[PDB]
Amino acid sequence: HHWGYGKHNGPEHWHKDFPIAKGERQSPVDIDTHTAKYDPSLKPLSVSYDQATSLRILNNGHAFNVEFDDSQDKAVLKGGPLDGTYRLIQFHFHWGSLDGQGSEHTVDKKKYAAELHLVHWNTKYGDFGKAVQQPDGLAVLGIFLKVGSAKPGLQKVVDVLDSIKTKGKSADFTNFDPRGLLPESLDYWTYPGSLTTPPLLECVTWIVLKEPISVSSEQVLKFRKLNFNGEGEPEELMVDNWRPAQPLKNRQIKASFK
Numbered sequence: 001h002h003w004g005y006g007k008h009n010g011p012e013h014w015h016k017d018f019p020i021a022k023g024e025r026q027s028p029v030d031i032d033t034h035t036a037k038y039d040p041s042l043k044p045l046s047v048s049y050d051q052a053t054s055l056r057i058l059n060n061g062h063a064f065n066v067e068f069d070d071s072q073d074k075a076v077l078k079g080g081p082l083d084g085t086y087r088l089i090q091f092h093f094h095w096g097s098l099d100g101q102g103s104e105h106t107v108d109k110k111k112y113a114a115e116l117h118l119v120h121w122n123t124k125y126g127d128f129g130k131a132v133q134q135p136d137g138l139a140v141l142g143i144f145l146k147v148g149s150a151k152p153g154l155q156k157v158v159d160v161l162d163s164i165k166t167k168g169k170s171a172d173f174t175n176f177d178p179r180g181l182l183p184e185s186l187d188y189w190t191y192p193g194s195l196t197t198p199p200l201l202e203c204v205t206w207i208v209l210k211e212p213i214s215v216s217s218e219q220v221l222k223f224r225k226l227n228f229n230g231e232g233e234p235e236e237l238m239v240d241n242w243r244p245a246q247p248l249k250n251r252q253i254k255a256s257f258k
């Protein structure tokens with residue numbers, strides 16, 4: 001029926017409706033640190049989020065997205081392995097039902113409690129929908145979350161969750177500053193890959209930061225209270241909305257550091 005993360009419509013079934021699931025550049029992947037190659041020609045990333053305009057938060061039935069105004073070069077990513085400017089359109093998380101799982105990418109097979117994806121689209125393409133028809137159409141910044149100390153900057157997101165508990169609900173969500181979600185270091189791994197949810201388009205340049213951010217147990221706990229279901233439908237908690245690691249195939253993971 002429609003895709004999800006359950007036993008009957010889970011990642012193992014996606015290929016039936018989206019054959020690209022068994023493609024050559026699928027994400028996420030396991031990051032083998034001993035095989036990733038340091039590339040000294042990679043430039044430092046340039047994250048310019050001071051003019052960011054958040055608009056809304058929405059429960060789309062698979063996760064919650066915070067959306068941004070992308071009509072101008074307000075919040076952009078450049079440098080790193082990228083050519084051109086990429087505009088932030090939305091961010092969302094993947095998390096688990098337990099602290100030992102929830103990330104999509106793994107590092108030497110290590111799974112984190114969650115993973116944040118900041119999705120950006122290549123401005124040369126004019127709009128999001130055009131960017132997803134190109135091999136260099138998107139850039140996703142991935143950040144691992146480990147449970148430890150609370151992250152002050154995440155608290156405003158945590159607090160609005162109650163209001164978008166069920167699928168289809170949205171809430172105004174202005175003046176949120178994504179800078180409060182970044183780790184101190186911008187060292188990263190990069191590889192060519194895809195979106196991790198259907199349509200699984202292979203248009204992404206992945207930029208996975210080495211340094212995880214800490215979140216508190218209570219922060220994570222509130223994510224686990226969301227619902228996959230719509231209002232008035234039987235309750236199915238929104239947990240484990242992550243795709244397992246895919247074969248690397250003919251791809252090389254590059255490191256911005258050694």
Ligand SMILES: [Hg+2]
Pocket residue numbers: 131132133134135136137201202203204
């Ligand atoms: Hg593409």
Ligand SMILES: [Zn+2]
Pocket residue numbers: 092093094117196
């Ligand atoms: Zn994602």
